[PDB]
Symmetry: D3
Subunit: 291 residues, 6 copies
């Protein structure tokens, strides 16, 4: 990449300046999942980008999922699943496995990758110092809300204690599990939890890494793809969208309505997508603002 | 326990005062393992004791093992073991399982138990913010030192960052895994790691919970049991001792020689053994001091 | 006290934990007087208990009286008293003697006793750094309110400066004298002053050491003795009570109504009564809460 | 004092500037005794001068004696004295009286006077928070050193804790009593104690208020009076001097040799002598420097 | 000045005490101009007085003008002026000259004079760290408001950042220039700017050095001179006053109405006028208070 | 610059990461002069680059010259010069002009440019709070060292006070003038002063903006141009070099020998040269390291 003239290398760096100003000293919550989590070069680029933010004096917070890895581990352990609708029931046994995979495996790899750049990453869950709690969630199947075991939503968040972590120069890598009011640990959808953390921390931005170019309003019409949309318009289009886009959009809606200036659906398939979305106007993502 | 006269209840509390003075504001590293970790009433008493220390303004640090749980998980996963001497070889696969069980299961339960008393516990490993590193260890089998994979000793310790944690009112619950100088995570014997943490943190005391009354010099002679011994005398008796007492004694030796005022082999089978050993002179344990 | 099984010694210590949690980092104001002040073993136990609180990270504040010692000194000096009702008139001369005995004798002994356990105690009065002021009080004799010289009530309190003292790890030992708005030092009833300090400091508890088992509602009916009562019910019973119980009850009323969660009338004749009342449910005292 | 031209009032103020520079943020220990302590207008001027120092951001520390007041109180109490040489033996009884008069009477008046200008003064002794200790002293009578009871010299000083007091904006008013290594409180000559405090605190100046114009080398030759002298020359002249000048000179010697830049023997009979000696070159005192 | 008795030197110093108390830790804004700025002995006395305030723990802030020096420099550079009414039009060229003379010459001399007493003075303008902004002002000539170029009023003030400067022990020496909302630097009348800084900083006093004894209500009637007046009465007399007294009075009005306890018109022709006005009741100035 | 593929824009940003890590929290002293100071687009790019560093949590310090502007002002004022060798003699008059142009004109423009991006820049000289001093320098003409008036070298530097400035988030813009030990302000060569500031502040890098591609060892041989060289080799080549390269090389030598890890001669004619040199390996400059 050095057959590229050095005066255009200058221009791309200098063009980052207004976004460096906007984010210096600010929290950015990054939902990390999908292919940016399974391909090794995307993974290493994601970790380097978190170190980038940290070495600009920005405060990244990383929230991660791990759906497929849990399924794989349960199959290896021969744990037979129960399914209501399209949902696995989270028995105490499935939770133990989920937590052990999310916190003891998926979070650990990301911590080590990030820490290749310095002593930055620290892994946590709602359980650690009671950072946050969960409330049991029901899901709606075939019209009826119903119980699927120990799954929840983020209840309340120790905002102060988390902000201390990032001001110390740490990158929290959050595994979405947390105790309920009775001390019973639930598993939390990582997309929703990221929106809840973003709003509780007064984040400047929420980034949602997904495996798509961005939100299409009439998928698969190629020119239905938007680069920016407001909460009011996004709320109306949501019952139109594909199954897997629902949680990423609901999280954005909730976050931006909760006061987070903007939320972003960006393409995790692009190397250094974080860098592209934050420090460049050539972003493929779609930006959600209030309106 | 109230058929007991209230003026003797006074005397037992008042008799704790000199040990409260000696430990106020001081670090105490507690190696936690054995039966105090599998029986639920001993477990709940261990957690309540950590909260006790914390609510006296003492700084407990908890180091935990989990040998049998790892074995059980490997069998469930059908992972065939390789054995040199009496040692399982820690392949990258066994390490992934070990870390996932130690940090994602065993540490999590203790964090939640402790946190039933308040937002105190926080789980970590050498990986988090590069708190400590490992160096690969060899073991000696049938006379010859030899490789058994990704097992190590604690190399160096970010003393400052850990002391910050405890001064914030947190109880670190340490799972003994850490990266080597190249970022490759090793598993560390929990007994040795506790001694290394104790010495690096300038701990006032190291407590080693084991399943025995204390050190017997001529096991099983009932009256060979000691209540106190010095490093010089303990060093000489060590090649005499039982297989499983070796690591607990080596850790004490190393810790006390490293400047930790005293190390204690106490009986994990006793409810609230920590409270008994620290705040009472009726301790069953054996105290190791330098000499 | 070691013919007592060590597993019951554990249980009494472990039973203190919820009261350690409730009082960690909290102010406790202790009115100290009566026999707990004249018998040497009770005195030494009172001082050791203050060191106990301090070495649990609790913030004890000690308020003391000294009625009889003042009388004795005035007789030694041949100072003839004037009496209205049952009250000595506090001339400037009597105040000089009172202050010199309270601050220069009674407070000093307690400071030295406490300091046998460490550099904790510090003696003060309203005069020092203008910590608190007094307003002249009148008393009612035979129906008529009337002047008895330089006696007062605590007027206002430098809450901030006192809290600094205890956060520095100090135990203030307060002699109840303070200047009025014109700089004229008055003597203050120690019971009332303790209630005023408790309320001004946001104390968690006020303990009143007196020479009785507790409040009897129909003295001397043995089974009129209560262990808990509310302000509304206590207010109604007050004109029924014995002469010397009035100030201890009024102080409790005022304190608990002022927002102090509970006030306690405990028996100063019991060694380590403080320890018994705070860290044990076998307390002989009576607890006052709002209602 | 306003028949004085306003442009000469300017000049006297402006002439204080170099001494304000030299003492800003510095400790000045002031031994206060003699007539500056018994005449009310001198007393009020002494207190106003301490407030002056404090309101220039200077850190005054006041050490006081009280010999005659102790004698008067002992006579009032009919306490028969024992005398070796010219020294009263300090029995435990005499100490109780001494402490009660120094701390409970003499110190209190000065605290209240100073506090007429603000919440500045705070009274203390070696006993409070173990600020300093004493070691038993013997005196030499008719050639032989001998015991005179509970009299001592300042042993060691909690330099840090005292400096905290003055940085908080407080004026410590010290009564010279302190515990020995066994907790037994001794009385300390106020002149010597002031020198010891000055040296322990790194004071910039020690001022010794005495009832004389200054040191005369050949008393009563009017022109033997000096305004400045060095430790070497002062040490040689000391066995020549009057009985009561010995302690004031020994204190200066010890202080200046201990590293205190200068010590000053100034006339307590002059209103606002402190102000004259510190902020004016027309001082009557004598300055001691090292040489 | 030493043919003056030393006991009257005491009295003048001691008479400063209540003004030291009133100003300790307080901001005093000093408009410095006129003859106190051109005569070298008045200048050196002004600088020594700023050091005096600083070495009493007072926080002086110095605002300075420099009208005549700008005129002289423009003539030296042959810059032809344009005049509307009696006002020079401030072209970009005149501003460059003004700023370069005010900040690069007049402010520098005062900084160096003050710094002869220590590392205190620091020169600044609205431009530095955006300490304050300007808004373009129009003037009224022959009845009509009209533009005279890049002249303004102080718009808003970074109160926090300035208070940090003085708490660090610095003396800001302010040259009255500042950017408007678009970054265009304007020149500001120093009298008005001093009033604006005084009000923004919560100053205790504003002193206005001018070349007159004080405000005369019927100049030149010798006994129309006042020593104190309120804002309501001063506002009514203002359209009566001389041309050059208008800005000094308007600044006082605005400041005292803005909450500054008092503003003072004092005679810059008097050596150490600052010292006389602040620490003496023989001040020639006139004090403005609200009413 | 958006006809450039967005995945190469990513790569240039991501390639800055190791230099962000190396400079986060570090001082970088930037000598700013030449054409990067007279062309408006280079100037605006220089200011934006200083804001860039600041919004990465880097601590830029800007040192500036202004030779030609001083000459122009002296000619406008008709100040006749005296010349020894090729040096103007700096009379007190020339110094007044120099300081007024450097601090009151050249520094002010840069402060305002930088401040277009935020409240960052602050202008200073050695005079402000005595930040640094000068010692009079002589120059050597035709073999003989000789006096050229009030020109000097940086003597000593208040390292602490400057580091406070940058930690507050400020960009100091230094005009190289400072008082000597007697308070007499001298003018200092900006190249040398930048090296002295770099060494006194423990700077990570010194950048020297000059109008050349870099150091040529055999100018004008096109392929004598180096990209890196050590102090030992650079010292030997220095008497070979062009007149104007001498000060830029001497400054580098002194700085790197003084412990500054590297000094850089970079081309001020390139837009955003700072960004290119720090965050890119395509730098045209030459790096000086010790050897
Ligand atoms: C010492 N390192 C590792 C742990 N880090 C944590 C982890 C968790 C928490 C918490 O949940 O409160 C705080 C610090 C701090 C830096
Ligand atoms: C230095 N020790 C002794 C005095 N202590 C006091 C005493 C009184 C006050 C006050 O009344 O403000 C503060 C500290 C602090 C610790
Ligand atoms: C380091 N010295 C010189 C500069 N001083 C300043 C100057 C300006 C500012 C500002 O305008 O923010 C702060 C400190 C601080 C002390």
């Amino acid at each position: 990449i050095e057959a590229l003239p050095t005066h255009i290398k200058a221009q791309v760096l200098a063009e980052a300046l207004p976004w460096l100003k906007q984010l210096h000293g600010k929290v950015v919550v990054v939902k990390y999942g999908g292919n940016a989590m399974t391909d090794d070069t995307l993974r290493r680029a994601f970790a380097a980008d978190m170190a980038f933010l940290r070495n600009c004096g920005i405060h990244p917070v990383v929230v991660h999922g791990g759906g497929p890895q849990i399924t794989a581990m349960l199959r290896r352990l021969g744990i037979e699943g129960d399914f209501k609708g399209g949902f696995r029931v989270t028995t105490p046994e499935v939770l133990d496995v989920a937590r052990m995979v999310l916190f003891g495996q998926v979070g650990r790899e990301l911590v080590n990758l990030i820490n290749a750049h310095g002593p930055y990453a620290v892994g946590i869950t709602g359980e650690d110092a009671q950072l946050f709690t969960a409330v049991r969630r029901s899901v709606t199947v075939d019209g009826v809300a119903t119980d699927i075991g120990l799954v929840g939503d983020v209840d309340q968040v120790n905002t102060a204690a988390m902000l201390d972590l990032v001001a110390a120069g740490r990158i929290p890598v959050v595994s979405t599990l947390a105790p309920d009011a009775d001390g019973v640990v639930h598993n939390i959808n990582a997309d929703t939890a990221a929106a809840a953390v973003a709003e509780a921390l007064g984040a400047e931005k929420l980034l949602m890494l997904t495996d798509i170019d961005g939100l299409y309003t009439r998928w698969p019409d190629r020119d239905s793809l938007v680069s920016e949309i407001d909460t009011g318009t996004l709320a109306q289009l949501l019952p139109t969208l594909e199954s897997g886009m629902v949680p990423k959009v609901e999280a954005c809606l909730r976050a931006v309505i909760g006061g987070v200036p903007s939320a972003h659906i960006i393409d995790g398939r692009v190397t250094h997508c974080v860098l592209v979305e934050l420090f460049t106007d050539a972003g493929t993502g779609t930006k959600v603002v209030r309106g």
